[PDB]
């Protein structure tokens, strides 16, 4: 059948994890134990086809890692995170799309821009202002709750339907 290779990327603690245990296992993980990487994968029906996701679950990055970079040149699509409450995640995003450009030497890369944590309401992100990031990218944007799972499957489908666009 046919498999997506999806990571997932974003600074520390903006709910990677949380957004994929959501996805993959149905339940929301309320502690906070930092990721190195993790991969998940899972047999799910898409648009009618069934498929394989393959989840690369990767930690927040402030420092050089060859084995981070290794780990994501398999990767199709990557799911950039920030959370709505973190104004340092959103201004981190641009680094990581550079990071996955490099890793894939390409300028055109399925991506999908998140903005988490959309439940809460302490928000110092307005979602036109990541619209607008999305929009220079050529990408789309995306709300998400790994808490209430609003948006959940939302994203991480659009990133397979983006991937075949490509
Ligand atoms: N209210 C709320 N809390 C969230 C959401 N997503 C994650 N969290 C909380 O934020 C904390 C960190 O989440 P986690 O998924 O571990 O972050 P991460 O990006 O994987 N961290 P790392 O980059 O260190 O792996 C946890 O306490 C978790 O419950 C969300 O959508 N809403
Ligand atoms: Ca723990
Ligand atoms: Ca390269
Ligand atoms: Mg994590």
Redesign the pocket.
Known sequence: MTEYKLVVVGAGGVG??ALTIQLIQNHFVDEY???IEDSYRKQVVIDGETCLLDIL?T?GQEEYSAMRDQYMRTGEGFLCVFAINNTKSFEDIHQYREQIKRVKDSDDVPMVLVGNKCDLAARTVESRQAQDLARSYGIPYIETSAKTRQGVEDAFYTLVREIRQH
Do not use: A
């Open positions: 990677k994890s134990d930092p990721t679950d930690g």
